[PDB]
Amino acid sequence: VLSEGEWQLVLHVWAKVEADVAGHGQDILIRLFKSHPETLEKFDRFKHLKTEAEMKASEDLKKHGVTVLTALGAILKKKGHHEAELKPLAQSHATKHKIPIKYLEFISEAIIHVLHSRHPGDFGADAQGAMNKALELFRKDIAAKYKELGYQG
Residue choice 13, 72, 127, 130 for contact with ligand HEM (CB under 6 A): 72
From 106, 132, 128, select the one nearest 116 (Cα to Cα).
128
The answer on whether 93 is annotated among ligand-binding residues is yes
- Distances, alpha carbon 113 to alpha carbons 80, 116, 118, in Å: 22, 5, 9
Check: CB of residue 80 under 8 Å from CB of residue 133.
no
Binding letters toward ligand HEM, positions 18-47, x by CB under 6 A: ---------------------x--xx-x--
Q: Is 6 helix (H, G, I), strand (E, B) or coil?
A: helix
Which is nearer to ligand HEM, 103 or 151 (by Cβ)? 103
The residue type found at 84 is: A
**107 binds ligand HEM, rule: CB under 6 A:** yes
Measured from the CB atom, is 69 or 127 closer to ligand HEM?
Answer: 69
Kindly report the backbone phi and psi dihedral angles of residue 79, in degrees, each rounded to the nearest multiple of 5, phi listed first: 50, 55
Task: Compute the distance between CA of residue 7 and CA of residue 60 in angstroms, rounded to an integer.
Answer: 32
Regarding 130 and contact with ligand HEM (CB under 6 A), the answer is no
- Residue pair 42/102 in contact by the 8 Å Cβ criterion: no
Number of chain residues interacting with ligand HEM (CB under 6 A): 16
Give me the count of residues in the chain. 153
Binds ligand HEM by CB under 6 A, chosen from 86, 99, 130, 137: 99
Would the annotation count 36 as a binding residue? no
* Residue (5 or 48) nearer to ligand HEM, CB: 48
Footprint on this chain of ligand HEM (rule: CB under 6 A): 39, 42-43, 45, 67-68, 71-72, 89, 92-93, 97, 99, 103-104, 107
Binding residues for nitrite, as ranges, are: 64
